[PDB]
Amino acid sequence: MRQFKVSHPGEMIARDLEDMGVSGRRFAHNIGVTPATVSRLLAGKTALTPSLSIRIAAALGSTPEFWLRLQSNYDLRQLENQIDTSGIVLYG
């Protein structure tokens, strides 16, 4: 079936940076983002956007697509039963 807990990619990245010895401040410097944006990210308070996904993959590897897919997967889980499609007519 589906994974019970789906994490916000930022919090995963946060746990990964800790296991690495890279601080939010250092990571921000490296990927070319303001420490303010990065800290909001590692808290899971802003989305991991396409512009970020390119930067982040340049630093933590894999593809920008992967990181973006994580965000989407999380975003749609967070949206389960939050949107009333009752409601909307499916064109036939």
Binding site: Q3, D16, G61, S62, E65
Partner: protein, 91 residues
Amino acid sequence: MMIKSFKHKGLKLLFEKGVTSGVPAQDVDRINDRLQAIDTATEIGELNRQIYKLHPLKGDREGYWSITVRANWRITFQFINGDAYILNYED
């Protein structure tokens, strides 16, 4: 990479039910992360991050792969087509 079976029942439990009784209490998040990666990747090359130290096995367990959780502990799985089988948490 759609996850099709578990060899390790402590993993199956964390994955499907979000229950932590079968895995080290300290590694819960770390392991959930890695499972989320395996689940999200569409290619095997997408798991070739530095911290994962992705590498194939020999094999014996051929077509098997491992990624590192921490220290000597690895998650392994057999890779047929685009799917992951027989997930395990060893060593």
